[PDB]
Amino acid sequence: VRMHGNGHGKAASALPYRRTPPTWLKSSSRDVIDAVCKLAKKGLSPSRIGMQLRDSMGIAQVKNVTGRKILRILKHKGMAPEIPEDLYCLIKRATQMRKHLERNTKDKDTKFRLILVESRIHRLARYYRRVKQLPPTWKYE
Amino acid sequence: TIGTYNEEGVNVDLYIPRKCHATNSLITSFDHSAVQIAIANVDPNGVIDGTTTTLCIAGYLRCQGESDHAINHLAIAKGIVRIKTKKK
Amino acid sequence: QPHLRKLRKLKRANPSQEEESVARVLFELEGSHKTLRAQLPRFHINTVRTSSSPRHKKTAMIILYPLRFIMLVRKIQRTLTAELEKRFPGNIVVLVAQRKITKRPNDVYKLQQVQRSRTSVAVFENILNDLIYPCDVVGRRWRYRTDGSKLMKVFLDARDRKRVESRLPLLAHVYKLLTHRTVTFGFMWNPKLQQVSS
Amino acid sequence: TMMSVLANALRCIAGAERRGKRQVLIRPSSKVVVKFLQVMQKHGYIGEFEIVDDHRAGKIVVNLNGRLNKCGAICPRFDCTARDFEKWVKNILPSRQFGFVVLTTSLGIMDHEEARARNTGGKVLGFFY
Amino acid sequence: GFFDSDLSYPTVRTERMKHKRRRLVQGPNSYFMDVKCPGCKNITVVYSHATSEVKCNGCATLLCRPTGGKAMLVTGCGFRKKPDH
RNA sequence: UUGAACUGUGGGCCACGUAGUGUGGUGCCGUACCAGUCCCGUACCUCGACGUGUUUUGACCCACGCCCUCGUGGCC
RNA sequence: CGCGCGGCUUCGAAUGAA
RNA sequence: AACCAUGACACCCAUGAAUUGGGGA
Ligand SMILES: [K+]
Ligand SMILES: [K+]
Ligand SMILES: [Mg+2]
Ligand SMILES: [Mg+2]
Ligand code: NA
Ligand code: NA
Ligand code: NA
Numbered sequence: 001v002r003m004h005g006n007g008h009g010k011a012a013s014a015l016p017y018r019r020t021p022p023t024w025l026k027s028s029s030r031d032v033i034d035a036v037c038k039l040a041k042k043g044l045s046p047s048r049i050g051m052q053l054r055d056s057m058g059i060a061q062v063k064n065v066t067g068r069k070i071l072r073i074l075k076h077k078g079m080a081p082e083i084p085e086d087l088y089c090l091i092k093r094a095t096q097m098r099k100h101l102e103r104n105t106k107d108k109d110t111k112f113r114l115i116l117v118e119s120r121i122h123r124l125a126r127y128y129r130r131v132k133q134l135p136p137t138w139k140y141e
Numbered sequence: 142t143i144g145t146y147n148e149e150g151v152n153v154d155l156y157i158p159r160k161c162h163a164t165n166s167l168i169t170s171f172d173h174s175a176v177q178i179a180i181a182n183v184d185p186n187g188v189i190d191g192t193t194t195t196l197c198i199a200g201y202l203r204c205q206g207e208s209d210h211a212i213n214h215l216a217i218a219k220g221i222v223r224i225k226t227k228k229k
Numbered sequence: 230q231p232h233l234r235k236l237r238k239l240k241r242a243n244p245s246q247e248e249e250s251v252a253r254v255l256f257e258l259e260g261s262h263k264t265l266r267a268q269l270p271r272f273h274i275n276t277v278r279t280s281s282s283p284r285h286k287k288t289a290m291i292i293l294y295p296l297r298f299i300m301l302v303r304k305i306q307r308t309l310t311a312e313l314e315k316r317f318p319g320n321i322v323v324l325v326a327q328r329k330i331t332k333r334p335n336d337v338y339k340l341q342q343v344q345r346s347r348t349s350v351a352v353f354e355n356i357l358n359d360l361i362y363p364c365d366v367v368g369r370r371w372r373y374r375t376d377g378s379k380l381m382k383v384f385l386d387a388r389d390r391k392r393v394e395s396r397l398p399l400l401a402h403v404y405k406l407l408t409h410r411t412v413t414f415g416f417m418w419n420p421k422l423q424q425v426s427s
Numbered sequence: 428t429m430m431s432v433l434a435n436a437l438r439c440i441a442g443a444e445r446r447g448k449r450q451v452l453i454r455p456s457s458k459v460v461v462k463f464l465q466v467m468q469k470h471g472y473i474g475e476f477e478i479v480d481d482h483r484a485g486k487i488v489v490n491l492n493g494r495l496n497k498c499g500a501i502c503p504r505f506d507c508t509a510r511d512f513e514k515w516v517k518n519i520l521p522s523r524q525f526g527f528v529v530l531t532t533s534l535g536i537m538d539h540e541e542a543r544a545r546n547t548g549g550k551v552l553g554f555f556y
Numbered sequence: 557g558f559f560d561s562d563l564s565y566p567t568v569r570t571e572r573m574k575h576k577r578r579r580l581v582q583g584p585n586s587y588f589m590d591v592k593c594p595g596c597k598n599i600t601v602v603y604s605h606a607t608s609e610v611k612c613n614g615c616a617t618l619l620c621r622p623t624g625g626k627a628m629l630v631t632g633c634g635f636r637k638k639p640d641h
Numbered sequence: 642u643u644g645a646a647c648u649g650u651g652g653g654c655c656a657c658g659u660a661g662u663g664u665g666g667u668g669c670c671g672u673a674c675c676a677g678u679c680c681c682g683u684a685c686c687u688c689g690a691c692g693u694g695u696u697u698u699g700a701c702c703c704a705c706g707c708c709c710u711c712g713u714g715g716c717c
Numbered sequence: 718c719g720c721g722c723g724g725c726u727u728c729g730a731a732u733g734a735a
Numbered sequence: 736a737a738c739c740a741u742g743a744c745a746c747c748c749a750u751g752a753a754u755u756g757g758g759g760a
Contacts, residue, residue: 485646
């Protein structure tokens with residue numbers, strides 16, 4: 001079940017059993033790392049980088065060729081984002097809701113949904129502090 | 142080697158019961174829907190031989206409507222039903 | 230004479246006949262083959278072993294090399310084992326890497342520190358992929374019979390059945406020799422739906 | 428959520444035996460599940476089973492033969508001393524002539540008849556008869 | 557109809573209908589294909605579903621259109637499926 | 642208060658007891674079947690392998706002494 | 718426009734993705 | 736009688752016709 005709702009969804013991706021590259025690929029490991037580094041220089045998130053390679057370059061499951069996950073590649077080159085991307089995207093949504101509520105005070109439904117989002121932020125930030133991905137004494141607001 | 146045996150060799154159990162060949166379960170004495178079917182063997186000629194193969198169906202399998210499905214598998218294993226049509 | 234450069238420096242004092250022949254054929258292969266001329270000079274062999282049995286009339290020659298060259302030989306395998314078979318009749322040629330195995334410690338705190346590539350399971354599977362490199366494993370099963378026996382079945386693609394079926398009885402012997410583990414093989418047309426070709 | 432994969436697997440097996448099936452599929456399986464199964468197979472209570480491998484927790488296909496009457500996990504895993512074997516038998520078994528209580532000791536997972544012979548003790552896991 | 561079906565080796569008929577992640581061993585549903593736009597001499601590899609935008613390297617023209625589900629190619633271009641491995 | 646999976650539970654010979662599978666070959670009776678002959682009909686009769694089921698190989702397990710640098714190396 | 722040659726100096730090892 | 740007078744999370748479990756939303760052939 002969803003953690004903050006009543007939906008029972010199952011849409012997801014199923015990964016292949018065979019992890020070896022498909023032998024029609026070319027595009028050696030060095031070229032893939034170059035393409036990842038070029039894209040991150042344009043401000044694309046780790047999730048958007050995997051999409052661009054998948055849809056236009058034939059690279060599915062970047063880990064399977066070059067053996068390294070996308071975030072690890074960016075950390076090594078020193079271009080990782082300051083805060084994790086899931087936390088950043090939750091914070092952006094809560095900011096837009098709050099800007100809307102300042103003009104629409106009677107929107108009691110968006111007030112209920114804002115409580116759920118901020119409960120998600122406080123649960124996530126507690127985790128990133130325990131595994132030292134965020135500075136201690138980091139506070140949302 | 143059926144039933145319970147003493148420290149001596151005497152078998153003290155009375156009325157060792159029947160075990161259904163489909164479900165491997167004891168057929169009790171108050172189960173009135175349990176049946177027995179006898180199927181005759183035949184010679185290379187079309188005349189019946191005089192020996193019968195016998196089958197046991199539990200009895201609750203009949204009321205569930207699964208009695209027919211079990212008989213097909215039992216007769217196939219016993220070698221009385223040809224599973225699939227032969228090649229041309 | 231330069232032909233021992235392909236052999237490792239330790240073995241250069243007392244090379245065996247099989248190792249000396251392998252070194253010589255590699256050296257002439259260095260300047261002859263057009264694409265093997267590159268990516269060959271950096272390579273050098275570790276050792277040579279031979280396995281033969283009363284059954285499986287052909288002979289098996291195992292060639293071990295340093296693990297640091299594994300990406301160098303994957304770009305030149307298939308063709309390499311072809312010409313080695315051409316030069317040496319009556320044998321099939323396998324190319325393996327050498328891997329260290331770390332035993333399982335008895336302390337939880339040391340267990341969390343063991344390297345993962347050095348564990349027994351990981352090494353054995355990389356051995357199997359080395360035995361059949363151009364192909365790959367598409368399935369794996371473990372059967373536990375009514376007695377204590379346990380079997381391990383590995384399935385391969387059926388698209389390459391013609392080019393690989395010959396070496397199967399021998400390769401199972403090589404795997405047991407190196408890792409003391411027994412494996413059976415099978416084929417799967419349409420691996421996606423688990424359709425076992427008979 | 429799913430808190431015990433041993434309680435799950437033993438519930439699937441006893442369920443399929445109640446209906447009358449011939450095979451079951453069990454997920455997600457683990458080392459403790461396999462060692463529990465081998466104890467039932469060695470005493471001649473299930474039959475051949477096989478493990479299908481995905482690059483995750485696997486699945487298990489178990490063949491039945493109509494001999495199992497019940498199997499279940501005990502939760503939480505209480506503690507049993509070598510003098511405490513009888514008390515458990517009197518509680519969760521139909522008779523002392525047949526049945527098994529599976530324990531986990533430092534020698535390994537094994538039933539209570541073998542554990543008494545080696546004169547050990549440990550935490551109970553389940554039972555079957 | 558007299559066949560006995562086991563769970564370890566399912567038949568082709570019953571397996572072809574199952575949802576992915578509901579099979580015996582889960583796996584992908586997608587694939588890759590070489591797409592040749594009219595002219596431009598270039599061959600591009602395009603994902604079957606490809607929610608993003610795709611432009612040919614040479615002519616800088618869009619090749620596929622996003623869609624809930626499979627992507628649809630522009631009218632001129634014709635594709636060719638690639639083997640799984 | 643309760644919490645998913647994973648790092649691993651050897652290999653040979655002993656020796657014969659035992660032991661199921663399948664494996665090959667062995668004889669291959671008796672019947673069936675296969676290919677043949679007479680030859681219907683529009684059924685049969687004659688003649689030369691294929692399948693049982695007698696034995697006998699390969700692994701599995703149970704009874705079991707030793708050895709193993711008890712994965713590979715690298716020594717000897 | 719590409720194209721190899723000569724001297725050349727300069728500075729990828731991580732369990733898996735419920 | 737804020738009622739399904741039926742607390743939340745997870746597993747297994749026989750059939751035949753319908754219906755709302757997305758996807759594949
Ligand atoms: K919820
Ligand atoms: K709806
Ligand atoms: Mg746990
Ligand atoms: Mg996940
Ligand atoms: Na909650
Ligand atoms: Na009401
Ligand atoms: Na109430």
